[PDB]
Amino acid sequence: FASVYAWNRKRISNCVADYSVLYNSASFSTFKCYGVSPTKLNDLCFTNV
Amino acid sequence: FNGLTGTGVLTESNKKFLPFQQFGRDIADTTDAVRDPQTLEILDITPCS
Amino acid sequence: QDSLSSTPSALGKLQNVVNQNAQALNTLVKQLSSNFGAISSVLNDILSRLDKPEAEVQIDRLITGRLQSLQTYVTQQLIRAAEIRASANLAATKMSEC
Numbered sequence: 744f745a746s747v748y749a750w751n752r753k754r755i756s757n758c759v760a761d762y763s764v765l766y767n768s769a770s771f772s773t774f775k776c777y778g779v780s781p782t783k784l785n786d787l788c789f790t791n792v
Numbered sequence: 793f794n795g796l797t798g799t800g801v802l803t804e805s806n807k808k809f810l811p812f813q814q815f816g817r818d819i820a821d822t823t824d825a826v827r828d829p830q831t832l833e834i835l836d837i838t839p840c841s
Numbered sequence: 842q843d844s845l846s847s848t849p850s851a852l853g854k855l856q857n858v859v860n861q862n863a864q865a866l867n868t869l870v871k872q873l874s875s876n877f878g879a880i881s882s883v884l885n886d887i888l889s890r891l892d893k894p895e896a897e898v899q900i901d902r903l904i905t906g907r908l909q910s911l912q913t914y915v916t917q918q919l920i921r922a923a924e925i926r927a928s929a930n931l932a933a934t935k936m937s938e939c
């Protein structure tokens with residue numbers, strides 16, 4: 744992983760995004776969403792991520 | 793339609809959409825026509841009586 | 842007959858009433874495109890993204906703005922209606938006396 748001052752960015756496009764595999768995971772200590780509910784992500788479409 | 797939700801009657805449109813155009817808009821900023829993401833058919837959206 | 846058929850402004854008084862009413866409705870409808878501080882002007886886009894407590898905050902902003910827009914419309918219509926009533930009363934008087 745990158746240092747925070749030199750953070751990495753990856754563009755994601757043209758694909759199917761399953762967000763429930765991440766949200767329903769027991770391995771993450773923090774999972775916070777803004778401007779959107781974490782339980783509605785699978786019903787949405789975006790231009791880029 | 794690709795995350796665009798609403799209620800209404802869908803019919804074949806006579807609107808001459810250009811190949812790059814995906815949907816039409818009214819003055820109320822609502823969608824009144826869409827291109828179907830699978831058939832690329834243009835449909836008119838009319839509110840239910 | 843010849844004057845009316847060649848004078849575009851002859852019936853301006855009646856056209857002005859039609860134009861003012863059409864303008865008022867167009868304004869009222871266009872206000873539905875305003876966010877009023879919300880993330881979106883479209884209720885369906887808010888409801889499809891946010892959960893109840895978050896959606897309610899955004900919806901309240903739209904209700905406040907849209908209610909104000911509608912109150913403005915009605916007030917203006919009441920004022921214009923009073924003007925038209927006065928005109929109609931004058932027309933009725935002229936019908937009787939002229």
Ligand SMILES: *[C@@H]1O[C@H](CO)[C@@H](O)[C@H](O)[C@H]1NC(C)=O
Pocket residue numbers: 829830831
């Ligand atoms: C998939 O979408 C393409 C257009 O992008 C269309 O030509 C094709 O027929 C669709 N396939 C199915 C099974 O609908």
